[PDB]
Amino acid sequence: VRGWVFGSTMNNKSQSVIIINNSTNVVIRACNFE
């Protein structure tokens, strides 16, 4: 288990930092929604 969700006021209302490792190659995005 390695997944990380951060933000405020979910479901298409504000940005969100997400941290998910992709085979020891850590993918980190900061704009996704729901």
Q: Which is nearer to another protein, 6 or 26 (CB)?
A: 6
Could you say whether residue 15 binds another protein (CB under 8 A)? yes
For another protein (CB under 8 A), the number of binding residues is 4
Instruction: Of 10, 3, 7, 9, give the one whose Cα is nearest residue 30.
Output: 7
Q: Please, is 16 exposed, middle or buried when counting C-beta atoms within 10 Å of its C-beta (0-12, 13-18, 19+)? A: middle
Q: Which of 1, 2, 3, 9 binds another protein (CB under 8 A)?
A: 9
Could you say whether residue 11 binds another protein (CB under 8 A)? no
Could you say whether residue 32 binds another protein (CB under 8 A)? no
